[PDB]
Coordinates of C-alpha atoms and ligand atoms in Angstrom, one line a residue:
X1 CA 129.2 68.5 -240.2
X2 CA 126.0 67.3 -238.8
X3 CA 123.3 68.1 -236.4
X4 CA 120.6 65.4 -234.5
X5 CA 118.6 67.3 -232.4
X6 CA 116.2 65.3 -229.8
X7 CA 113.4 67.2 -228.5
X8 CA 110.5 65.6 -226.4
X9 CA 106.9 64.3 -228.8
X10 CA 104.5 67.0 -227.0
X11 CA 106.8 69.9 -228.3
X12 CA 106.6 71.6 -231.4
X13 CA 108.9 69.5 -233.2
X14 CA 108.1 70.4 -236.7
X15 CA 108.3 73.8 -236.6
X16 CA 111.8 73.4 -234.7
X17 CA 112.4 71.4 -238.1
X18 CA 111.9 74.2 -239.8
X19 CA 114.3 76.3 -238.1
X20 CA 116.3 73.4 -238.9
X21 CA 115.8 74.0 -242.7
X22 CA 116.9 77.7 -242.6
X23 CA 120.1 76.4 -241.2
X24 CA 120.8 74.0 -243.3
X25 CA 119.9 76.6 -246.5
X26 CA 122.4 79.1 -245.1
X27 CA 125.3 76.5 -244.2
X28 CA 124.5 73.3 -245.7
X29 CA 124.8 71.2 -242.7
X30 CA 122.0 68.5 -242.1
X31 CA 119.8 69.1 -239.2
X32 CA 117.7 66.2 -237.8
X33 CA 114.8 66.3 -235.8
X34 CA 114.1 63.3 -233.5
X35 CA 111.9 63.1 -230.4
X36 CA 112.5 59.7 -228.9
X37 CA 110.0 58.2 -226.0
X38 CA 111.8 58.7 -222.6
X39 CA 114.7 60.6 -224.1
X40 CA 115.7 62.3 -220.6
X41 CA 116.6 59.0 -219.7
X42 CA 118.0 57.5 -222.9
X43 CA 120.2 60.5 -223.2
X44 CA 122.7 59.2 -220.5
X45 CA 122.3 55.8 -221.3
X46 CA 123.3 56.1 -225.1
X47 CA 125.4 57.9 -223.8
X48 CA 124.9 59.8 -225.5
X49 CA 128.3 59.3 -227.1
X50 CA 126.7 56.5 -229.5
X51 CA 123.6 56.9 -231.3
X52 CA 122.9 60.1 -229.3
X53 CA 121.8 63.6 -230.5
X54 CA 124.5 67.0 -230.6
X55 CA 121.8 68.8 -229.0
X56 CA 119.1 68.1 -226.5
X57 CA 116.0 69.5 -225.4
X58 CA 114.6 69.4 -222.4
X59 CA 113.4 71.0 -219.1
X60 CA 116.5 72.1 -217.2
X61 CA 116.0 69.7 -213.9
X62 CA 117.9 66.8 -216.3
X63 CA 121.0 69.0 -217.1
X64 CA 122.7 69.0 -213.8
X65 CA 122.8 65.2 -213.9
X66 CA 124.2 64.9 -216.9
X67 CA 126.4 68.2 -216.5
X68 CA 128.0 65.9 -213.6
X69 CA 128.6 62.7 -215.9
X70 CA 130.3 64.7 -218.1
X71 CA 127.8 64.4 -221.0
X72 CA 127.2 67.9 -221.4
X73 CA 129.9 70.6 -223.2
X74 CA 129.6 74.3 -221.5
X75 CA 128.7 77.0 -223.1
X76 CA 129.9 80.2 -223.4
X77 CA 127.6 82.7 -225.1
X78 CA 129.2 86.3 -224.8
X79 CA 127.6 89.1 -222.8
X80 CA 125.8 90.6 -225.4
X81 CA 123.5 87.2 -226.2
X82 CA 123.2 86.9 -222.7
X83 CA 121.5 90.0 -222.0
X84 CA 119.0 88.7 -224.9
X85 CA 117.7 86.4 -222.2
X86 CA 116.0 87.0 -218.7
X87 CA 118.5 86.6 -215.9
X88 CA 116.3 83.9 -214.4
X89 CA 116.7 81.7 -217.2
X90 CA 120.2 81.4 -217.1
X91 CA 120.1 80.5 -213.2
X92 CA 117.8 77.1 -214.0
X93 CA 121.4 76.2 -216.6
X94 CA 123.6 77.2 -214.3
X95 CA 125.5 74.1 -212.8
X96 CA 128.7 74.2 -210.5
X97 CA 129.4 77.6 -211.5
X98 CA 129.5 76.8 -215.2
X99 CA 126.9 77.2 -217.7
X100 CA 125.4 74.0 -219.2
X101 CA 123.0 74.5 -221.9
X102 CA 120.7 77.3 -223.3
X103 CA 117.3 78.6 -221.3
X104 CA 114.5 78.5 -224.1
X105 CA 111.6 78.8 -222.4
X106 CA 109.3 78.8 -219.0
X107 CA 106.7 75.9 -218.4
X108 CA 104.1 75.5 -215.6
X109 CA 101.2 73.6 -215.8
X110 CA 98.1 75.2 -215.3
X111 CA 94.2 74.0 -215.2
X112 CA 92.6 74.1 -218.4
X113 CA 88.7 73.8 -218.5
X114 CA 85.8 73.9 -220.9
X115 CA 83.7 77.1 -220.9
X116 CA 80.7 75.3 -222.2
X117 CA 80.9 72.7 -219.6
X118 CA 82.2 74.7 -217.0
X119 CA 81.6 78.5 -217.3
X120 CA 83.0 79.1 -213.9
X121 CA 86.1 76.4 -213.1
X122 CA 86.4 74.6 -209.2
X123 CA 88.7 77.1 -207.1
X124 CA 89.2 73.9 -204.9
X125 CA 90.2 70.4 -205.7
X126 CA 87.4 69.3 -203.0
X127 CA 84.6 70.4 -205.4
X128 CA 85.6 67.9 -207.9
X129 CA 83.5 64.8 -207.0
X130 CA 80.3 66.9 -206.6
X131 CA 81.4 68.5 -209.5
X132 CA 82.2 65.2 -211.0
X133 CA 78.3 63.4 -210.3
X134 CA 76.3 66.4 -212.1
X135 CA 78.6 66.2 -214.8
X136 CA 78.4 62.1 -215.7
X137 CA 74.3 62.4 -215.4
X138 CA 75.3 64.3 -218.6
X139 CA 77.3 61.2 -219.8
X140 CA 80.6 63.9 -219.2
X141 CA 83.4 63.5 -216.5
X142 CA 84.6 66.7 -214.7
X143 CA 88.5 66.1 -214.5
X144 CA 91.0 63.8 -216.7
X145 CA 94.5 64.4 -216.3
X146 CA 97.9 62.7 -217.2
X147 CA 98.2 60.9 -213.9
X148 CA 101.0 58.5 -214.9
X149 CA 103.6 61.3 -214.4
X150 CA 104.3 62.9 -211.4
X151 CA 105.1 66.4 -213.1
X152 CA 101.3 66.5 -213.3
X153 CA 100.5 64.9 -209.6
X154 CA 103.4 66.6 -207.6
X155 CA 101.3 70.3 -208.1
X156 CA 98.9 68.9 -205.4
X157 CA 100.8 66.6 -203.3
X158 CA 103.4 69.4 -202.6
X159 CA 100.6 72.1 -201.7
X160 CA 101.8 72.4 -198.4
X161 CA 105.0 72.7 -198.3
X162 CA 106.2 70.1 -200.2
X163 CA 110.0 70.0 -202.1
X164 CA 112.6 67.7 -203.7
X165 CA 115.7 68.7 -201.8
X166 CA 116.1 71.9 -199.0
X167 CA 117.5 75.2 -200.6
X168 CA 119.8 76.1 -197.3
X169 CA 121.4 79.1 -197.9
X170 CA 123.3 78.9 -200.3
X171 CA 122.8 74.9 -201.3
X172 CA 120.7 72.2 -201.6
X173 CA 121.0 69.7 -199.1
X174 CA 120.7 66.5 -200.7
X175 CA 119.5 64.3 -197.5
X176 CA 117.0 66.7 -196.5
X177 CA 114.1 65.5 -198.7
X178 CA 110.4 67.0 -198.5
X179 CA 107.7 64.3 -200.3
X180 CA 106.5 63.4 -197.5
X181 CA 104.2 64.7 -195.1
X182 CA 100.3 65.6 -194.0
X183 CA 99.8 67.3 -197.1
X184 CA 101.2 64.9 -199.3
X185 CA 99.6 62.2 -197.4
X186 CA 96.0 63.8 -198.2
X187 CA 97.0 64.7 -201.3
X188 CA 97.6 61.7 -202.5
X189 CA 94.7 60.0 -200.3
X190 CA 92.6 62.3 -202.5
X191 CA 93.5 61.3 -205.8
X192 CA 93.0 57.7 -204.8
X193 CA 89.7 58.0 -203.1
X194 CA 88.5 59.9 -206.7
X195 CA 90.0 56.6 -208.5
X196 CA 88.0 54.5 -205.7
X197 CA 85.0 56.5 -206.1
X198 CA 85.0 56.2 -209.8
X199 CA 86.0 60.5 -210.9
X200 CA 88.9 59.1 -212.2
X201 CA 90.4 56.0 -213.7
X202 CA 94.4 54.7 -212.5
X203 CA 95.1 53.9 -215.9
X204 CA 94.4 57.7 -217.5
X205 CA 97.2 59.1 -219.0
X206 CA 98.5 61.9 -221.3
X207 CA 97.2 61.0 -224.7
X208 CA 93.8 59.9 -223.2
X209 CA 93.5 63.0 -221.1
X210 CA 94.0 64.8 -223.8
X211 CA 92.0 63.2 -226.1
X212 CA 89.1 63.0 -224.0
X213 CA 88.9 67.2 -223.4
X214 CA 89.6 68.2 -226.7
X215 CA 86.6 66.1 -227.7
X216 CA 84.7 67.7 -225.2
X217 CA 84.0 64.7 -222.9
X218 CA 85.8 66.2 -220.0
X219 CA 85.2 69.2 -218.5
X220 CA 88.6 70.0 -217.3
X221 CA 92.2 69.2 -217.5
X222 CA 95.7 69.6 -216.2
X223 CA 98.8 70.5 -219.0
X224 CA 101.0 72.9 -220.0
X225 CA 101.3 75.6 -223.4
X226 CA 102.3 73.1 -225.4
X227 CA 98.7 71.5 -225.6
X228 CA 97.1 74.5 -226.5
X229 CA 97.7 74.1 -230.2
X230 CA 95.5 71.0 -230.6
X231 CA 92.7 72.2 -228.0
X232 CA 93.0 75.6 -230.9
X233 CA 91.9 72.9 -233.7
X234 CA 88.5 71.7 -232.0
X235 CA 85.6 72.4 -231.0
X236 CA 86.2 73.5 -227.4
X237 CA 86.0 76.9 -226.4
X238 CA 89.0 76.3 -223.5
X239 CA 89.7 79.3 -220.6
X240 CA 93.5 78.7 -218.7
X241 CA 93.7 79.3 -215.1
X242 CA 94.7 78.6 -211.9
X243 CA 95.2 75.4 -210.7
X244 CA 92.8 74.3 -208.1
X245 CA 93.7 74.3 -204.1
X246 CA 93.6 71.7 -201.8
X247 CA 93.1 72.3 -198.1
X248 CA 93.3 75.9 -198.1
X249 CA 96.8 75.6 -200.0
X250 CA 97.6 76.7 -203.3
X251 CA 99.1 74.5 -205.7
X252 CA 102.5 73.9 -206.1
X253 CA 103.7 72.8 -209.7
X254 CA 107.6 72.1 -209.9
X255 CA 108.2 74.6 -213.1
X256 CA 110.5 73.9 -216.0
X257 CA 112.8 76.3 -218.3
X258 CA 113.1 73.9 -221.7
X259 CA 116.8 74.3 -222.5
X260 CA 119.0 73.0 -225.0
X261 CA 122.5 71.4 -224.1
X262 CA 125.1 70.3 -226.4
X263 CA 126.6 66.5 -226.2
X264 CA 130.4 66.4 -225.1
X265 CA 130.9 63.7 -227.3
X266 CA 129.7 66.2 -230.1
X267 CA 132.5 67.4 -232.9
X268 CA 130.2 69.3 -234.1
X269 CA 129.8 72.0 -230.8
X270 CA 130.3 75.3 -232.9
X271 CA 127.6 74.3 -235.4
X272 CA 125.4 73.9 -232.5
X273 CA 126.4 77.0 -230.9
X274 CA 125.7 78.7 -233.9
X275 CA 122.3 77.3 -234.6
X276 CA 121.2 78.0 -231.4
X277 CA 122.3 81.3 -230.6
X278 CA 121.5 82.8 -234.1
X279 CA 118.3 80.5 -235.4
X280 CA 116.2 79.5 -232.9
X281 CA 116.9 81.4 -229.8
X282 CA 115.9 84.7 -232.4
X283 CA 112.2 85.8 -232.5
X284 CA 111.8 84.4 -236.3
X285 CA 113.1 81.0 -234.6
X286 CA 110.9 80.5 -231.7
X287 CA 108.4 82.3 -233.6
X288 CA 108.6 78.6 -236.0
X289 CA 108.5 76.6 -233.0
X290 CA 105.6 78.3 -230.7
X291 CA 103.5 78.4 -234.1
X292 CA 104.0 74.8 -234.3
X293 CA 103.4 74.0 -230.1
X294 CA 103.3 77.0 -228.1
X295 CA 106.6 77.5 -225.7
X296 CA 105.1 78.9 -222.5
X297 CA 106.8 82.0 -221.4
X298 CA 110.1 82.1 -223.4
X299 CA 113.4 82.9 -222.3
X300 CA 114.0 86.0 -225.0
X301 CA 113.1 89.3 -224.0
X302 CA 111.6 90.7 -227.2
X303 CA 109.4 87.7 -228.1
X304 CA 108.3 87.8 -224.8
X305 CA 107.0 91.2 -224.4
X306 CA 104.6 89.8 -227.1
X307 CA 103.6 86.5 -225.7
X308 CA 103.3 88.2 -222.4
X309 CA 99.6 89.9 -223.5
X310 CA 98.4 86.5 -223.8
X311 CA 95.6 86.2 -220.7
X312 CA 96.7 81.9 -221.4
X313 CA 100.5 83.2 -220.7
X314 CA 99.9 85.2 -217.6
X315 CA 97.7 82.7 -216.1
X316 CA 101.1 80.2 -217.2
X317 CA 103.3 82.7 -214.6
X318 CA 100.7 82.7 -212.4
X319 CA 100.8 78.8 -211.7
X320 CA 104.6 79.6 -211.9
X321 CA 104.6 82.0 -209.2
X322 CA 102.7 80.0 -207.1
X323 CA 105.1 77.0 -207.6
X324 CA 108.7 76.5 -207.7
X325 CA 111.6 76.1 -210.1
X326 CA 112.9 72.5 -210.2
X327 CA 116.5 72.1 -208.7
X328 CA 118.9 71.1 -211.7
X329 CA 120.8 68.9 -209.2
X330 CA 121.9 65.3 -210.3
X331 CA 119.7 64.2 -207.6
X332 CA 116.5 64.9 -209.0
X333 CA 116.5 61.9 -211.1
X334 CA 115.6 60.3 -208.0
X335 CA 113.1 62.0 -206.9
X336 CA 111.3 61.8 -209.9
X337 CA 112.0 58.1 -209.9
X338 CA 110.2 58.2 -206.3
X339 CA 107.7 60.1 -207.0
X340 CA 106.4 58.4 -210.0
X341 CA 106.8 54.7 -208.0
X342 CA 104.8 56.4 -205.1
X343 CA 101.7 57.7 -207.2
X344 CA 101.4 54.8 -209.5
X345 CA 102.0 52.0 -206.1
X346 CA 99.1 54.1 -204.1
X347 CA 96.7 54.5 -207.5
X348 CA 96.9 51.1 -208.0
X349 CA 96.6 49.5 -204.4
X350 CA 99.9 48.4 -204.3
X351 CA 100.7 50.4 -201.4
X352 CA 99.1 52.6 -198.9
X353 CA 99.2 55.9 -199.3
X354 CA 101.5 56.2 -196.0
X355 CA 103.9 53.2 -197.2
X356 CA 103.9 54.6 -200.9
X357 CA 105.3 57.8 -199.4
X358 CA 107.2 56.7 -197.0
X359 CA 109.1 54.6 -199.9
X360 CA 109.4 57.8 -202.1
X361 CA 111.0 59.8 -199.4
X362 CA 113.7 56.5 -198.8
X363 CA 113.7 56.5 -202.7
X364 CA 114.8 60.1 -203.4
X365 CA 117.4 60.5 -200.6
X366 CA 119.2 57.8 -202.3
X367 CA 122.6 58.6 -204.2
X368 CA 121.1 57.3 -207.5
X369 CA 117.9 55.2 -208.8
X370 CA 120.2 51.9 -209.5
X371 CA 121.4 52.1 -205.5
X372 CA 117.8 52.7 -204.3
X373 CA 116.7 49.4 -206.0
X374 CA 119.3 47.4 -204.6
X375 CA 118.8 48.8 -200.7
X376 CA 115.0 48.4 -202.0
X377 CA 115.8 44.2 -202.9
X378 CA 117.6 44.3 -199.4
X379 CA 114.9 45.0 -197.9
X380 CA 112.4 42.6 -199.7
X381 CA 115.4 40.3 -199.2
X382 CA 115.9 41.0 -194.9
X383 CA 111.6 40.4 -194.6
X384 CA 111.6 37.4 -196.4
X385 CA 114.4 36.0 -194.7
X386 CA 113.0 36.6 -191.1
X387 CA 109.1 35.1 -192.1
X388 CA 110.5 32.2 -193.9
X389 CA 112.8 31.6 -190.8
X390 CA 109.7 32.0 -188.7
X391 CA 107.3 30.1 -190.7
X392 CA 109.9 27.2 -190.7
X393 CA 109.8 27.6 -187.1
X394 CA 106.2 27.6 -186.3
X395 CA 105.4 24.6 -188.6
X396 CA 108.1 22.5 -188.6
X397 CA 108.2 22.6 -192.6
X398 CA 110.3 24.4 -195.4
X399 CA 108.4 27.3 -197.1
X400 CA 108.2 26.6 -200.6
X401 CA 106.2 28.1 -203.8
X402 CA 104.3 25.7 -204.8
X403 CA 104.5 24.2 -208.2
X404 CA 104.2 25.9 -211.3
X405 CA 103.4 29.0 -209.2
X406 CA 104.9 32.2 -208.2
X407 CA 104.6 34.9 -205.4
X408 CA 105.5 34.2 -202.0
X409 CA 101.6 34.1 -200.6
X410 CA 103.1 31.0 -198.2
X411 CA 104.6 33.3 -195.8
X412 CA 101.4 35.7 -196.6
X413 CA 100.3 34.9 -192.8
X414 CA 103.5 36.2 -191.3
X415 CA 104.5 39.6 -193.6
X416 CA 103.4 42.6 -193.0
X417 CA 103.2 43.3 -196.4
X418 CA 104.0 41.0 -198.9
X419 CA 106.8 41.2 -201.2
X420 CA 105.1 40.7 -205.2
X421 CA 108.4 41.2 -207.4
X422 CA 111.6 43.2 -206.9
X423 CA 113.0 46.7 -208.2
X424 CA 115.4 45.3 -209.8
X425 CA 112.9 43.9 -211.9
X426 CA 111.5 40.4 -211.3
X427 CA 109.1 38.2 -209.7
X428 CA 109.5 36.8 -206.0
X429 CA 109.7 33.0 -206.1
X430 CA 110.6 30.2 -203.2
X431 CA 112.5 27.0 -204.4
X432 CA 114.7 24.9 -203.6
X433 CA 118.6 24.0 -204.7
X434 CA 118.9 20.9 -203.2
X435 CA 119.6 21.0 -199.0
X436 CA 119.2 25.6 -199.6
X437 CA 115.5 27.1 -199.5
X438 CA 116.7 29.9 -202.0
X439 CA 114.7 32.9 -203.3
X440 CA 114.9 33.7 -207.0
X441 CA 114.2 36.6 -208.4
X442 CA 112.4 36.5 -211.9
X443 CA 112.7 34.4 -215.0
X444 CA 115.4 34.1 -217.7
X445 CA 113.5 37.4 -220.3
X446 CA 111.6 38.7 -217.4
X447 CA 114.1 39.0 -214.4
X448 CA 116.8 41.1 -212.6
X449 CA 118.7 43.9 -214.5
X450 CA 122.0 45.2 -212.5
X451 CA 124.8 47.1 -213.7
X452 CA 128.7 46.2 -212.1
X453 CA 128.2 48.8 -209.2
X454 CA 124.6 47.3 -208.2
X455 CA 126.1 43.9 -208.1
X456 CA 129.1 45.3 -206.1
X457 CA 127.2 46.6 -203.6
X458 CA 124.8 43.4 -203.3
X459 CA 127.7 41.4 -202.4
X460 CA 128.9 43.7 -199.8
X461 CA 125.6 44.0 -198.3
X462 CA 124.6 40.2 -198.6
X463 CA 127.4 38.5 -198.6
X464 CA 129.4 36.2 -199.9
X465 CA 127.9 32.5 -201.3
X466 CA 124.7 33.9 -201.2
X467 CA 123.9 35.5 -204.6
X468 CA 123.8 33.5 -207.8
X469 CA 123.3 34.0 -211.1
X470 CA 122.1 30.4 -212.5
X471 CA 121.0 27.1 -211.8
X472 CA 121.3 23.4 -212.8
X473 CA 118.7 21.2 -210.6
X474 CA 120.0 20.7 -207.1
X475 CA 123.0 22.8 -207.5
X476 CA 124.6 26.3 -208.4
X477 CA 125.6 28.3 -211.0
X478 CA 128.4 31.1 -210.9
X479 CA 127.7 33.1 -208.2
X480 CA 127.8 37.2 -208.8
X481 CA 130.4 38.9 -208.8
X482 CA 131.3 42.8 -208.3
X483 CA 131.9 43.2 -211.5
X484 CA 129.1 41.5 -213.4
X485 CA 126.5 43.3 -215.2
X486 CA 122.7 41.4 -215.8
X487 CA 120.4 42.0 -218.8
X488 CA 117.3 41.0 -218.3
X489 CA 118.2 37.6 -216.2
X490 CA 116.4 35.5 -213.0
X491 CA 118.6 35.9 -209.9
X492 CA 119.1 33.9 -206.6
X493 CA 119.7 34.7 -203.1
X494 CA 119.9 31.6 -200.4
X495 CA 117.6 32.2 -197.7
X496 CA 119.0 29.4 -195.8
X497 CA 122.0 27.3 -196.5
X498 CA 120.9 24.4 -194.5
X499 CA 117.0 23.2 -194.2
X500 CA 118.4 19.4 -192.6
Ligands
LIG1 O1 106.8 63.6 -214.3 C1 108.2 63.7 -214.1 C2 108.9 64.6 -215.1 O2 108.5 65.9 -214.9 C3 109.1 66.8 -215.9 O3 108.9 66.4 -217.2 C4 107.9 67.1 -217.9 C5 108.5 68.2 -218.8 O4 109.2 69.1 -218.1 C6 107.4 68.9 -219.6 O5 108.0 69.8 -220.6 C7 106.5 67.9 -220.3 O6 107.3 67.3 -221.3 O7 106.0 67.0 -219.4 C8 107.0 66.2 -218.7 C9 106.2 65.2 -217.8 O8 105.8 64.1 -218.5 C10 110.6 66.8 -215.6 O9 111.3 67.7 -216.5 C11 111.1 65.4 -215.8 O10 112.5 65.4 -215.6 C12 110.4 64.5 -214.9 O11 110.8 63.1 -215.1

């Protein structure tokens, strides 16, 4: 008997550790502690019935996913541990009727601020520049935040009534998405005018946010319990509060419950079962853990009552209230997926704000992420096609990248907006294989990556003797097939068959 825990790097990991240790002590079973980067995401991809952990922590919007791959084992903790917990909890683990991990604890982000540098914190988001001006005449910034993730993002974007997927009574309807509209459109709008007018930098993320307030540089910040710890160890004398509005609207943070599932592919279940019920869900167990990286508002009762005098807690359930649950549904992969794409594309330039939302919204009403690339490429694929027809049309010549180039900046006159590389991974490039203008996608080490269903559907969508997965000179390779898988490999698509 063994047990390989993964938990996520912010949490207290350590102190979860030591719970491990008491374990072990009383029944001489191993218990590892590993917090791998992007773990959500590995978990199903390991799968994790390889190298994967018995347990997993995370925030409860992952579970139902993996719940519907099978990867997860239900639980069935008896009435009496049940009651241990508040009833809420166990609703954000409930999946199909089924219960599919243990509720730990309640995270919501809220805004975190420097007394010294800001006795009285913004109410609004709209004071932030202003705010932001004063503050660098002192060689300070007012407000760095992890803006990389859209856990930290979505709070203002959804203000006004913003949401993943419509609760109709009783169910979530999976094609009714809600990313975007007006208040997502000048939410978002806002965060890139403070990157254009210099309050904020694109590339800020979680350990420079971070880094930046607890050495007093910046005034406030944007995070959740778990950061409290190392804010405790400096200099900063920090307040926790509400997070700001924007237009009149209050924000809206999507709010986790940390749980902890057990992998189907696990033989050791009842070990798991055992250490979670009777170690760390205990107030000597979280206790461990919250000391280490504080919890948020945990899931047992008795702890709670504690935690809940802390002014940093009830400002925690305040944010909470004013926000929502996440949905566990497998679908919220997606939305995450578009969400992210949509923040990162308008922070950078690569979109507008209007097309980087309208993308997320196509993005997250998609079955998965892998079938949203592919109708993505289609796309990319059905413009391309259409300006390279016209430009062939309108010049009398064949559209080709020029040499030792890539891009597509040929047809750049006759796009709308130009296609830069595909999400499927891979640069957009026009050459030719002999009498075919073809578009390949990528480079052999930095191309394509598709799994057998991608391809599959590709085929259907394209065609057939249109897709290829090599070249020799002037003529093809094996074309794709439904059933081919691609790691990390340049792909081609004719444009047109015959350029005589
Ligand atoms: O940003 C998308 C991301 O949001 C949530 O992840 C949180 C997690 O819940 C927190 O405990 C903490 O670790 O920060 C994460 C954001 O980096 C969702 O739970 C996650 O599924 C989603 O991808």
């Amino acid at each position: 008997g063994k047990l390989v825990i993964w938990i996520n790097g912010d949490k207290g990991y350590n102190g979860l550790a030591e719970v491990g240790k008491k374990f072990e002590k009383d029944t001489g079973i191993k218990v590892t502690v590993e917090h791998p980067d992007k773990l959500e995401e590995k978990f199903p991809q390991v799968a994790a019935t390889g190298d994967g952990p018995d347990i997993i922590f995370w925030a409860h919007d992952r579970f139902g996913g993996y719940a519907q791959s099978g990867l997860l084992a239900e639980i069935t903790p008896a009435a009496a541990f049940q009651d241990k917990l508040y009833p809420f909890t166990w609703d954000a683990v409930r999946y199909n009727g089924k219960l599919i991990a243990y509720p730990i604890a309640v995270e919501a982000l809220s805004l975190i601020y420097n007394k010294d540098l800001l006795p009285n914190p913004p109410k609004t988001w709209e004071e932030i520049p202003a705010l932001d001006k004063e503050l660098k005449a002192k060689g300070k910034s007012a407000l760095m935040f992890n803006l990389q993730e859209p856990y930290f993002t979505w709070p203002l974007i959804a203000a006004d009534g913003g949401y993943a997927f419509k609760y109709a009574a009783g169910k979530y309807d999976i094609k009714d998405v809600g990313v975007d509209n007006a208040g997502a459109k000048a939410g978002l709008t806002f965060l890139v005018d403070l990157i254009k007018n210099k309050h904020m930098n694109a590339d800020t993320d979680y350990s420079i946010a971070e880094a930046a307030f607890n050495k007093g540089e910046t005034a406030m910040t944007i995070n959740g319990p778990w950061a409290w710890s190392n804010i405790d160890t400096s200099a900063v004398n920090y307040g926790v509060t509400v997070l700001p509005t924007f237009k009149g609207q209050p924000s809206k943070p999507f709010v986790g419950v940390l749980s902890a599932g057990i992998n189907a592919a696990s033989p050791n279940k009842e070990l798991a079962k055992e250490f979670l019920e009777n170690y760390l869900l205990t107030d000597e167990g979280l206790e461990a853990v919250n000391k280490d990286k504080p919890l948020g508002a945990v899931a047992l009762k008795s702890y709670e009552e504690e935690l809940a005098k802390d002014p940093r807690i009830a400002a925690t359930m305040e944010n909470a209230q004013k926000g929502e649950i996440m949905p566990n549904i497998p679908q919220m992969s997606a939305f995450w997926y578009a969400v992210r794409t949509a923040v990162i594309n308008a922070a950078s330039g690569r979109q507008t704000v209007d097309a980087a939302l309208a993308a997320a919204q196509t993005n997250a009403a998609a079955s998965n992420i892998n079938k949203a690339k592919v109708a993505s490429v289609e796309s990319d694929y059905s413009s391309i096609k259409s300006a390279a027809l016209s430009y062939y049309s309108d010049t009398n010549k064949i559209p080709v990248t020029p040499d030792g180039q890539t891009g597509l900046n040929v047809l750049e006159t006759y796009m709308e907006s130009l296609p830069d590389k595909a999400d499927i991974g891979g640069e957009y490039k026009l050459i030719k294989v002999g009498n075919k203008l073809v578009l390949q996608i990528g480079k052999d080490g930095e191309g394509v990556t598709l799994t057998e269903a991608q391809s599959a559907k590709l085929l259907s969508d394209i065609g057939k003797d249109k897709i290829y997965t090599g070249v020799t000179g002037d003529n093809f390779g094996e074309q794709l097939k439904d059933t081919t898988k691609i790691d990390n490999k340049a792909l081609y698509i004719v444009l047109i068959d015959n350029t005589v």
